[PDB]
Design an enzyme around this catalytic site. Structure first.
Site, mmCIF file in Angstrom:
data_model
loop_
_atom_site.group_PDB
_atom_site.id
_atom_site.type_symbol
_atom_site.label_atom_id
_atom_site.label_comp_id
_atom_site.label_asym_id
_atom_site.label_seq_id
_atom_site.Cartn_x
_atom_site.Cartn_y
_atom_site.Cartn_z
ATOM 1 C CG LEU A 1 -1.967 -1.122 1.220
ATOM 2 C CD1 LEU A 1 -2.703 -1.238 2.563
ATOM 3 C CD2 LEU A 1 -2.944 -0.920 0.068
ATOM 4 N N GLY A 2 1.901 1.281 0.866
ATOM 5 C CA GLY A 2 2.833 2.405 0.876
ATOM 6 C C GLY A 2 3.848 2.399 1.992
ATOM 7 C CE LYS A 3 8.142 0.288 1.008
ATOM 8 N NZ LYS A 3 9.418 -0.227 1.579
ATOM 9 C CG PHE B 1 9.338 4.736 11.620
ATOM 10 C CD1 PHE B 1 8.360 3.740 11.528
ATOM 11 C CD2 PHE B 1 9.381 5.504 12.788
ATOM 12 C CE1 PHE B 1 7.432 3.551 12.556
ATOM 13 C CE2 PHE B 1 8.461 5.314 13.817
ATOM 14 C CZ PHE B 1 7.494 4.337 13.704
ATOM 15 C CB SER C 1 6.660 -1.097 4.642
ATOM 16 O OG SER C 1 6.042 -1.337 3.395
ATOM 17 C CB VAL C 2 1.211 0.420 5.121
ATOM 18 C CG1 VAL C 2 -0.197 -0.064 5.462
ATOM 19 C CG2 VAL C 2 1.753 1.403 6.156
ATOM 20 C CE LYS D 1 4.503 2.313 10.367
ATOM 21 N NZ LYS D 1 4.330 3.776 10.685
ATOM 22 C CG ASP E 1 4.315 13.806 9.034
ATOM 23 O OD1 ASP E 1 4.246 14.803 8.271
ATOM 24 O OD2 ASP E 1 4.828 12.717 8.701
HETATM 25 O O1 LIG Z 1 -1.522 3.122 6.949
HETATM 26 C C1 LIG Z 1 -1.736 3.489 5.817
HETATM 27 N N1 LIG Z 1 -2.854 3.289 5.140
HETATM 28 C C2 LIG Z 1 -3.933 2.478 5.348
HETATM 29 C C3 LIG Z 1 -4.542 2.034 6.478
HETATM 30 N N2 LIG Z 1 -5.599 1.316 6.079
HETATM 31 N N3 LIG Z 1 -5.706 1.296 4.729
HETATM 32 C C4 LIG Z 1 -4.687 2.028 4.286
HETATM 33 C C5 LIG Z 1 -4.434 2.275 2.890
HETATM 34 N N4 LIG Z 1 -3.324 2.813 2.382
HETATM 35 C C6 LIG Z 1 -3.512 2.865 1.054
HETATM 36 C C7 LIG Z 1 -2.685 3.321 0.036
HETATM 37 C C8 LIG Z 1 -3.138 3.253 -1.266
HETATM 38 C C9 LIG Z 1 -4.391 2.729 -1.593
HETATM 39 C C10 LIG Z 1 -4.853 2.715 -3.037
HETATM 40 N N5 LIG Z 1 -4.965 1.391 -3.739
HETATM 41 C C11 LIG Z 1 -5.986 0.473 -3.124
HETATM 42 C C12 LIG Z 1 -6.184 -0.815 -3.924
HETATM 43 O O2 LIG Z 1 -6.376 -0.606 -5.340
HETATM 44 C C13 LIG Z 1 -5.332 0.221 -5.887
HETATM 45 C C14 LIG Z 1 -5.250 1.581 -5.201
HETATM 46 C C15 LIG Z 1 -5.224 2.275 -0.577
HETATM 47 C C16 LIG Z 1 -4.763 2.347 0.732
HETATM 48 N N6 LIG Z 1 -5.331 1.992 1.923
HETATM 49 N N7 LIG Z 1 -1.024 4.339 5.066
HETATM 50 C C17 LIG Z 1 0.320 4.121 4.611
HETATM 51 C C18 LIG Z 1 0.340 3.585 3.216
HETATM 52 C C19 LIG Z 1 0.776 4.982 3.474
#
Ligand SMILES: O=C(Nc1c[nH]nc1-c1nc2ccc(C[NH+]3CCOCC3)cc2[nH]1)NC1CC1
Length: 286
Positions: A13-15, A18, A20-21, A40, A130
């Site tokens: 999903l992303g960084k 510090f 990764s998720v 995470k 942040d």
């Molecule tokens: O903790 C995080 N996010 C989340 C907690 N619960 N759900 C998320 C989450 N992060 C996402 C990052 C991108 C997307 C988009 N994609 C979803 C699936 O199809 C393609 C697009 C969803 C996220 N949910 N954020 C970190 C990744 C920066």
């Protein structure tokens, strides 16, 4: 509790600041019907970072609010944070993709929602440090939640700021002046950062007009490393500020500038910000 081995990876999903998720399926029956969750994990699982990450977990865990991503659990081996998966991604990306087809009634709904998430944060003597569209998640068209508490600090009992040494990587272009000069973080410096989040929303994440691009423009693109901070301090000290985004309602631009006040005590509270933002949405609606 969640068992490590039942976590099946689906995609990154992303960084964040510090870790990764990942998107995972907790599928203990292996028949592929299990709950999809966000996960995470520490990239560089030091003993220093491991403390901050468990501190992060304990903060999130203790926060229950409609506008703060939900905590679900932990996994032990090293720690992993399990969270609700929010399918629409970061607000920064969602607004960037769907530009301007998100009208002002929507931006102010998110704004309101951000304010309320922070008001409650502050009620528990926490400082996010942040607040940024990229750290705000979108549940659906009509809901965003605040996330990524990796840099969050609790205030001491008898202090109203938290002074940090030694600073790690730091979102300086969201930092209030006293955070840059003195490392004082407070509810007030989060309010400064909220003003930049509002600027972000009304620029519709046009990349030429982001805080870094614009502050860099104002201090000089020739400024490098440590000097960027020197010149940013001077700039902020003299009321150098991000301009009003093209098309921004006028009483939204005043909220921005009130937040970006050098005088720390003179900045609005989130309680007042939330009331004010809701007031504007009333009159827009009629
Ligand atoms: O903790 C995080 N996010 C989340 C907690 N619960 N759900 C998320 C989450 N992060 C996402 C990052 C991108 C997307 C988009 N994609 C979803 C699936 O199809 C393609 C697009 C969803 C996220 N949910 N954020 C970190 C990744 C920066």
């Amino acid at each position: 509790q969640f068992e490590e081995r039942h976590l099946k990876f689906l995609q990154q999903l992303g960084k964040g600041n510090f870790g990764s998720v990942e998107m995972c399926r907790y599928d203990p029956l292996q028949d592929n019907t299990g709950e999809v969750v966000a996960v995470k994990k520490l990239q560089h699982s030091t003993e220093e970072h491991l403390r901050d990450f468990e501190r992060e977990i304990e903060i999130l865990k203790s926060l229950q609010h409609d506008n703060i991503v939900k905590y679900k659990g932990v996994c032990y081996s090293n720690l992993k944070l399990i969270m609700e998966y929010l399918p629409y991604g970061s607000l920064r990306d969602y607004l960037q993709k769907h530009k301007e087809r998100i009208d002002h009634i929507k931006l102010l709904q998110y704004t309101s929602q951000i304010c309320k998430g922070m008001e409650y944060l502050g009620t528990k003597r926490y400082i996010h440090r942040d607040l940024a569209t990229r750290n705000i998640l979108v549940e659906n068209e009509n809901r965003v939640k605040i996330g990524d508490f990796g840099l969050t600090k609790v205030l001491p009992q008898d202090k109203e700021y938290y002074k940090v040494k030694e600073p790690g990587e730091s979102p300086i272009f969201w930092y209030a002046p006293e955070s840059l000069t003195e490392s004082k973080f407070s509810v007030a410096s989060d309010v400064w950062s909220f003003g930049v989040v509002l600027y972000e929303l009304f620029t519709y994440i046009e990349k030429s007009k982001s805080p870094p691009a614009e502050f860099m423009r104002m201090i000089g693109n020739d400024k490098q490393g440590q000097m960027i901070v020197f010149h940013l301090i001077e700039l902020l000290k003299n009321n150098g500020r991000l301009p009003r985004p093209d098309g921004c309602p006028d009483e939204i631009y005043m909220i921005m500038t009130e937040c970006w006040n050098n005088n720390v005590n003179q900045r609005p509270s989130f309680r007042d910000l939330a009331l004010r933002v809701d007031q504007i949405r009333d009159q827009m609606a009629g």
